[PDB]
From a paper:
Filoviruses encode a viral protein termed VP35 which is important for nucleocapsid assembly, replication and transcription and also plays a critical role in host immunosuppression. VP35 binds to and likely masks viral dsRNA from host factors, which leads to suppression of RNA silencing, inhibition of phosphorylation/activation of interferon regulatory factor 3 (IRF-3) and antagonism of the type I IFN response. The structures and accompanying dsRNA-binding analysis performed by dot-blot assays and isothermal titration calorimetry reveal that MARV VP35 RBD coats the sugar-phosphate backbone along the length of dsRNA in addition to capping at the terminus, suggesting an alternate mechanism of dsRNA masking for immunosuppression.
MARV VP35 RBD was crystallized in space group C2221 with one molecule of the VP35 RBD in the asymmetric unit. Interpretable electron density was observed for residues 208–329 of the RBD. Like the VP35 RBDs of EBOV and RESTV, the RBD of MARV VP35 contains α-helical and β-sheet subdomains connected by a short loop. The α-helical subdomain contains a four-helix bundle followed by a short fifth helix and features the conserved first basic patch containing residues K211, K237 and K241. The residue F228 is located in a hydrophobic pocket that bridges the α-helical subdomain to the β-sheet subdomain.
Numbering used by the authors: 208 to 329
The structure:
C-alpha cells in the first residue's frame, strides 16, 4: 500500500476538499509508509472509525498516539506565496512556533519564495 493510495483511502472518509485534514492525511500517510507501517496505520484508523469516531478526530487521535508519528517535525512545503495554500486551509495558518511537531497539531510548514513561513494548525 503506497502513501498515495493510503492518503486516497483516508480521503474517502473526510468531509470537504483540500482541508487541513486532507493535508494531515497526506503527511501521515507518507510517514507511515516510510516507517513500514502503512498497513498498521490503516488498520488502526479503521479500528477507530468502528468505534464511532469519524475521520477528522480519528486522524488527530492517531497523530498523537501512533508510534510512527511521535515527535516527528512537520514537513516544509514550498509555495510561491500563501495565496497558493488551499482556501479551506487559510484560516488554519499560524506563525511558526519554536518547536512544532505533528503530534502537537502542527501539520506542515508552508514556506514562501522568500522564506516567509506559516504553520498549518489542526
Amino acid at each position: 500500500l503506497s502513501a498515495k493510495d493510503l492518503a486516497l483511502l483516508l480521503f474517502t472518509h473526510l468531509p470537504g476538499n483540500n482541508t487541513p485534514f486532507h493535508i494531515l492525511a497526506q503527511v501521515l500517510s507518507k510517514i507511515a509508509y516510510k516507517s513500514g507501517k502503512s498497513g498498521a496505520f490503516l488498520d488502526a484508523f479503521h479500528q477507530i472509525l468502528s468505534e464511532g469516531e469519524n475521520a477528522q478526530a480519528a486522524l488527530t487521535r492517531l497523530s498523537r498516539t501512533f508510534d510512527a508519528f511521535l515527535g516527528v517535525v512537520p514537513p516544509v512545503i514550498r509555495v510561491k506565496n500563501f495565496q497558493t495554500v488551499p482556501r479551506p486551509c487559510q484560516k488554519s495558518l499560524r506563525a511558526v512556533p519554536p518547536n512544532p511537531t505533528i503530534d502537537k497539531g502542527w501539520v506542515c510548514v508552508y514556506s514562501s519564495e522568500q522564506g516567509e513561513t506559516r504553520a498549518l494548525k489542526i
